[PDB]
Amino acid sequence: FVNQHLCGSHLVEALYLVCGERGFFYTPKA
Amino acid sequence: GIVEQCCASVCSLYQLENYCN
Numbered sequence: 140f141v142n143q144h145l146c147g148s149h150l151v152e153a154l155y156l157v158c159g160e161r162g163f164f165y166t167p168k169a
Numbered sequence: 170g171i172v173e174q175c176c177a178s179v180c181s182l183y184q185l186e187n188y189c190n
Contacts, residue, residue: 141185146176150185153175157182158189165188167170 141156143149154163171188174180 141182142179143175144179147172150171150175150180153180154171154185154189157185162190163188164190165170 141153143153151163171180171184174184
């Protein structure tokens with residue numbers, strides 16, 4: 140499908156390909 | 170969180186959806 144290999148804020152760009160655009164988030168805490 | 174999860178081997182969309190708003 141969209142599936143990839145990379146790191147970081149490319150899984151934002153994967154998130155953008157999956158879920159869509161409009162403000163999209165991140166939920167864990169450390 | 171999906172910084173690293175994909176930075177290893179290959180990852181699905183349900184992994185990516187998880188985080189999303």
